[PDB]
Design a protein around this ligand. Structure first.
Ligand SMILES: CNC(=O)n1ccc2cc(Oc3ccnc(NC(=O)c4ccc(C5CCN(CCO)CC5)cc4)c3)c(OCCOC)cc21
Ligand SMILES: [Cl-]
Length: 267
């Protein structure tokens, strides 16, 4: 039996569950009635994460921990924000903001040659940087930053997902891969691969490279090549994110500052 929290508790009769959206815990589309108490007759489209039918006691503990983490972090434009929850007299439902256009990898893959400009791709990169600047300032390490874990809203807002949970190897920094040392600097390495994903329109990184070979290539100092539709300045930003010593990588503050200047100058 879970403790009630009046700040976040939505009644179950205010939540109409819809189609399944995604299958590490089950997610469904839903409609919430009267979230903003200013307008109690308004319907809001929401994503509702829950446990699977064959879920353990440890899975419940993780999903509770995930909910409590999201309360502490607070609201930002470029993250999947908590909107409410159903904890009492039924299954745990963690209600969050709905992102109608899916994850960023599929969004880009679908829109390969409506078309997206150069300015749209750098804007997309800036919003992911701005959202990670926030999560870093709230002391939250992602551990798994990628285009699959960025969602896209109806109004083209990039929202970071699956942040701070208690193949992925191609996004991990060497220190994270070898020693399991996850830091804010290892999330920058992962952001570098996320840039490479954006400017390849959802490309698969290190293609035809097995797991055993990828350990050696990074140790020896090999990196991914420049994309075709991509400037030199933006590739230097990728290469700086992929610096071997973690202290020498840029911060998300610097990346936000650099990307803000680039979006302004791009057409
Ligand atoms: C730290 N904890 C958290 O961050 N989280 C807590 C709860 C939680 C819930 C999450 O699920 C959500 C949230 C918001 N939106 C979604 N959207 C979709 O799945 C979606 C996917 C694909 C389509 C496509 C449908 C078909 N057409 C085709 C053209 O018409 C193209 C769009 C449309 C929609 C899922 C989540 O996202 C990551 C995992 O997703 C399974 C992170 C979460
Ligand atoms: Cl609420």
């Amino acid at each position: 039996e879970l403790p009630e929290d009046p700040r976040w508790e939505l009644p179950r009769d205010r939540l109409v569950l819809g189609k399944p959206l995604g299958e590490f815990g089950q997610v469904v589309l839903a409609e919430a009635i009267g979230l903003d108490k200013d307008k109690p007759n308004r319907v809001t489209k929401v994503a509702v994460k829950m446990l699977k039918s064959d879920a353990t006691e440890k899975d419940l503990s993780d999903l509770i921990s995930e909910m409590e983490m999201m309360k502490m972090i607070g609201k930002h434009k470029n993250i999947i924000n908590l909107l409410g929850a159903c904890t009492q007299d039924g299954p745990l439902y963690v209600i969050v903001e709905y992102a109608s256009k899916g994850n960023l990898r599929e969004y880009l893959q679908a829109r390969r040659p409506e078309q997206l400009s150069s300015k749209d791709l750098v804007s997309c990169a800036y919003q992911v940087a701005r959202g990670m600047e926030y999560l870093a300032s709230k002391k939250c390490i992602h551990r798994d930053l990628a285009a699959r874990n960025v969602l896209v809203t109806e109004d083209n807002v990039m929202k970071i997902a699956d942040f701070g949970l208690a193949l992925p190897v191609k996004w991990m920094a060497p220190e994270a891969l070898f020693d399991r040392i996850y830091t804010h600097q290892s999330d920058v390495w992962s952001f570098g691969v996320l840039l490479w994903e954006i400017f390849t329109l959802g490309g698969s990184p290190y293609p035809g490279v097995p797991v055993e070979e990828l350990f050696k290539l990074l140790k020896e100092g090999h990196r991914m090549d420049k994309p075709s539709n991509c400037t030199n300045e933006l590739y230097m930003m990728m290469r700086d994110c992929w610096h071997a010593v973690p202290s020498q990588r840029p911060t998300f503050k610097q990346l936000v500052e650099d990307l803000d200047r680039i979006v302004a100058l791009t057409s």
